[PDB]
Structure 1
Amino acid sequence: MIERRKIAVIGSGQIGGNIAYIVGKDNLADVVLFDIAEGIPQGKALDITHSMVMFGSTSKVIGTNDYADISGSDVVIITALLFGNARILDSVAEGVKKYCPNAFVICITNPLDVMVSHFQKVSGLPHNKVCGMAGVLDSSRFRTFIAQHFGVNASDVSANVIGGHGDGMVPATSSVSVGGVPLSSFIKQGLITQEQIDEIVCHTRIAWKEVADNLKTGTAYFAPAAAAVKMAEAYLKDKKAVVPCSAFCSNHYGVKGIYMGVPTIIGKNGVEDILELDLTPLEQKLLGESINEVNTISKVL
């Protein structure tokens, strides 16, 4: 039988608000914008609600502080200190298991891989149904910077970022393709140098700071919101789409069962598969260092 798709967004900050806006604008689902803070989620939901007619959308967008309102959610996006982040996840995990245990859960909470692992543990949801948003944001930046260099549509650039965050982030130069032309082929054609590739890789790692330093009083929120919506579409439309994200990886990249940044295939069953990229020896080590860092910090919590 037909029910409207339902996306619950936990946290009415800047990311959460724009997720609700975009979801509503696209008529992808109804939105429940959850936050404990009084007024904020109601105000944004009312504001967004007024725009629905402007976009020709019939999506319903409401604000709340009651987990009961996320009952039957198809997707839960969690945007809401290490210990403090864990406290928030624990609270949502209880809400999700009571009211929407079949939900696909997308975490946007640092340190990502560790926090995603924690939510899976405390919620007890299938590992394939819990993931984290980072790779799509990082990969989109990576693709954009490569696109800027060649003067081409970024959508026609293939480029994935795997691993964790900061220096744990691994932009896989070996994954890079423009219109089917590999990066190695461009070097030989004299259209790019290894120095310029290294700069793009470095630029991908520090892009967050480029935005943060310019915003002065906050971090990026337009692109992280778009990324989360793209992950939610993949699930809701059963796209079998390639989504770099923090996912439960076993028997790929030499790990046996751990949350890490990988190129997944997402569909109606959440993470349905993981792709194995060719990595250079230095990319192997950086990926190994990222895995160790997640595994070690998971010992603490």
Structure 2
Amino acid sequence: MIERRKIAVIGSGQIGGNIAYIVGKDNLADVVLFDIAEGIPQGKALDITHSMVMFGSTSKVIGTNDYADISGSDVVIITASIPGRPKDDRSELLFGNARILDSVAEGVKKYCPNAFVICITNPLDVMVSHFQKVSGLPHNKVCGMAGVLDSSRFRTFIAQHFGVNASDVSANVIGGHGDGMVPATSSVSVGGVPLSSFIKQGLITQEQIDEIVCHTRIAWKEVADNLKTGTAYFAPAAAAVKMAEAYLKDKKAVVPCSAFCSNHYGVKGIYMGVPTIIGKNGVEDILELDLTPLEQKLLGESINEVNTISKVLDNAP
């Protein structure tokens, strides 16, 4: 008995609304846009419902403040967060967003415990870890969106240098979504050609690569300082939809994201950004990148950042 796919978006602010809009435009699923703020999800859903006939989609998009409406959701995307952009570090939202997730975790557990959950709420790696702990869902059914956005940014910057289509740049960012993220230049390729080759050829300099690595690392502040009123939300929404697609269409897509890693990268059971294979059973596998010693070390420092914020959360007021 064919049933329409259903995605619940918890939090209907900037990112949440664009997720709804893109999912409906692609006719990927019906969408349930959930928020505790009166009127916001309802009006965004009505406005998006009107664009449906324009896109040729028959997806249904409704607004709600009732967890009961997310029952049967195949995928839950969590964007809910306290207000205001982080001033210097995504960690500043730690205390407030962990409380919100406790609440979202109760709604999920009761209305759609078999859903694939994708967290977006910052500080990402720690929020995903917190969510999985308080909700009790299987590790492979809970992951965080970050890698796809960090890697799209790294691929884009590399592509803008060489003047080529970014889809032809292969490049991963691993580790937690924060200042210590590791854009792995060691395995970047452009049409099959490694960066070491472009250096010999004289078409890119190590300094140029270094600037790309840095740009990647603090790209969030560049966008946030220009928007003034908030942080990025167009690409983070497209990234969440790519992850939801991988699950709903059982793609076996290789997706860098925050996933529970306990056997690769020399860690034994932590959520962090790694290349995963996503399909109908959620995170189905993690791939082992070939890191240089210097990279294995920068990863090591990333992991410590994650552990530190995490201990801080464990000792919250």
Same fold (TM over 0.5): yes
Which sits farther off after the overlay, 212-221 or 154-163? 212-221
1:71 Cα deviation after fit? 0.3
Larger CA deviation: 271-280 vs 55-64: 271-280
Q: Is the CA contact (8 Å cut-off) linking 2:179 and 2:218 kept in structure 1? A: no
* Partner Cα separation in structure 1 for residue 101 and residue 275 of structure 2: 24
Q: Distance in 2 between matches of 1:73 and 1:203?
A: 37
Retained in 1: the 8 A contact 2:147–2:177? Answer: no
Partner of 2:28: helix, strand, or coil?
coil
- Quick one: distance in 2 between partners of 1:118 and 1:289? 21
Give aligned pairs, total. Answer: 301
Q: Give the match for residue 70 of structure 1.
A: 70
Shift of 1:189: 1.4
Unaligned runs of 5+ in 1: none
Alpha-carbon offset, residue 213 of structure 1: 1.3
What is the CA–CA distance in structure 2 between the aligned matches of 1:125 and 1:182, rounded to whole Å? 40
- Looking at structure 1, the residues matched to 178 and 95 of structure 2 have their Cα atoms a distance apart, in angstroms, of 20
Q: In 1, are the aligned partners of 2:8 and 2:70 still within 8 Å (CA)?
A: yes
Determine helix, strand or coil for the equivalent of 2:273.
Answer: strand
Q: Once the two structures are superposed, what CA deviation does each residue of 1:178-202 show, in whole Å capped at 9, x if it has no partner?
A: 1111111111211111111101111
- Output the CA distance in 1 between the equivalents of 2:169 and 2:261: 25
Distance 1:139 1:240 in 2: 18
Given the two structures, how large is their TM-score scaled by the length of structure 1?
0.98
Q: Distance in 1 between matches of 2:220 and 2:266?
A: 29
Deviating above 4 A after TM superposition, structure 1's stretches of 4 or more consecutive aligned residues are none
Q: Secondary structure of the residue that 1:146 maps to in structure 2?
A: helix
Q: Partner residue of 1:83? A: 95
Taking the aligned partners of 2:105 and 2:307, their CA distance within structure 1 comes to 21
Distance in 2, Cα, partners of 1:125 & 1:216: 36
The alignment partner of 1:54 has SS state of helix
- The alpha-carbon deviation at position 209 of structure 1 amounts to 1.2
CA distance in 1: counterparts of 2:75 and 2:215, whole angstroms: 32
- Greater shift, 21-30 or 82-91, is seen at 82-91
Q: Distance in 2 between matches of 1:234 and 1:140?
A: 16
- How far has the Cα of 1:167 moved from its partner? 2.3
Displacement of 1:281: 2.0
C-alpha RMSD of matched pairs (Å): 0.9
1:146 CA drift (Å): 0.6
Residues 203-212 or 49-58, more deviating:
203-212
Structure 2 stretches lacking a partner, 5+ long: 81-92
Contact 2:260 2:270 in 1 (8 A): yes
* 1:1-301 matches, cutoff 5 A: 1-80=1-80, 81-301=93-313
Structure-2-length-normalised TM-score: 0.93
Shift of 1:208: 1.1
